[PDB]
């Protein structure tokens, strides 16, 4: 499913991401825009053989099992395919584990490079939440 900006903001807010570990909603919506262009079905292969999955491009080296990343850790305890669903619950619950890991939202390279220190509130501007 390809989310609208405000539709996704509302879903993330309902799932408890607004201010989770101090990150306002706009940060999460910005990360999703640049990671996956709001498409829950996005996949991208990494040079090391791992793959990133879904709206927040969560990586199979650490976070999920895809049956093809030898030595992967499955920290969210979930098949990676679960992260591609139109229901963002699995992605959101896994993202909460990731952002609590010690590096905050720096775990998402597009967030570091494209959202961090920008006016992220613009991403929720005009939305009914
Ligand atoms: Pt939902
Ligand atoms: Pt594996
Ligand atoms: Pt709402």
From Swiss-Prot:
It is found in: Secreted. Its EC number is 3.2.1.17. It holds the Pfam family Lys. PROSITE patterns: GLYCOSYL_HYDROL_F22_1 (PS00128), GLYCOSYL_HYDROL_F22_2 (PS51348). SMART domains: LYZ1 (SM00263). Substrate binds at residue 101. Transmembrane segments: none annotated. It catalyses: Hydrolysis of (1->4)-beta-linkages between N-acetylmuramic acid and N-acetyl-D-glucosamine residues in a peptidoglycan and between N-acetyl-D-glucosamine residues in chitodextrins. Disulfide bonds join 6-127, 30-115, 64-80, 76-94. SUPFAM superfamilies: Lysozyme-like. The keyword Signal applies. Residues 1-129 form the C-type lysozyme domain. The active site is at residues 35, 52. It comes from the Eukaryota. One of its GO terms (biological process) is killing of cells of another organism. One of its GO terms (cellular component) is cytoplasm. Coiled coil: none annotated. In the egg white and polymorphonuclear leukocytes. One of its GO terms (molecular function) is lysozyme activity. It is an enzyme of class 3 (hydrolase). InterPro entries: Glyco_hydro_22, Glyco_hydro_22_CS, Glyco_hydro_22_lys, Lysozyme-like_dom_sf. Lysozyme C is capable of both hydrolysis and transglycosylation; it also shows a slight esterase activity. It acts rapidly on both peptide-substituted and unsubstituted peptidoglycan, and slowly on chitin oligosaccharides. Lysozymes have primarily a bacteriolytic function; those in tissues and body fluids are associated with the monocyte-macrophage system and enhance the activity of immunoagents. Has bacteriolytic activity against M.luteus. Monomer. Belongs to the glycosyl hydrolase 22 family. This is Lysozyme C.
């Amino acid at each position: 499913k390809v989310f609208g900006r405000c539709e996704l903001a509302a879903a993330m807010k309902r799932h408890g991401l607004d201010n989770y570990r101090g990150y306002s909603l706009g940060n999460w919506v910005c990360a999703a825009k640049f990671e996956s262009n709001f498409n829950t079905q996005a996949t991208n292969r990494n040079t090391d053989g791992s793959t990133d999955y879904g709206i927040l491009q969560i990586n199979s080296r650490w976070w999920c099992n895809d049956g093809r990343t030898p030595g992967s850790r499955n920290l969210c305890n979930i098949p990676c395919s679960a992260l591609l669903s139109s229901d963002i619950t699995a992605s959101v619950n896994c993202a909460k584990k990731i952002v609590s890991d010690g590096n905050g939202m720096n775990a998402w390279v597009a967030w570091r490079n494209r959202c961090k220190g920008t006016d992220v509130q613009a991403w929720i501007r005009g939305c009914r939440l």
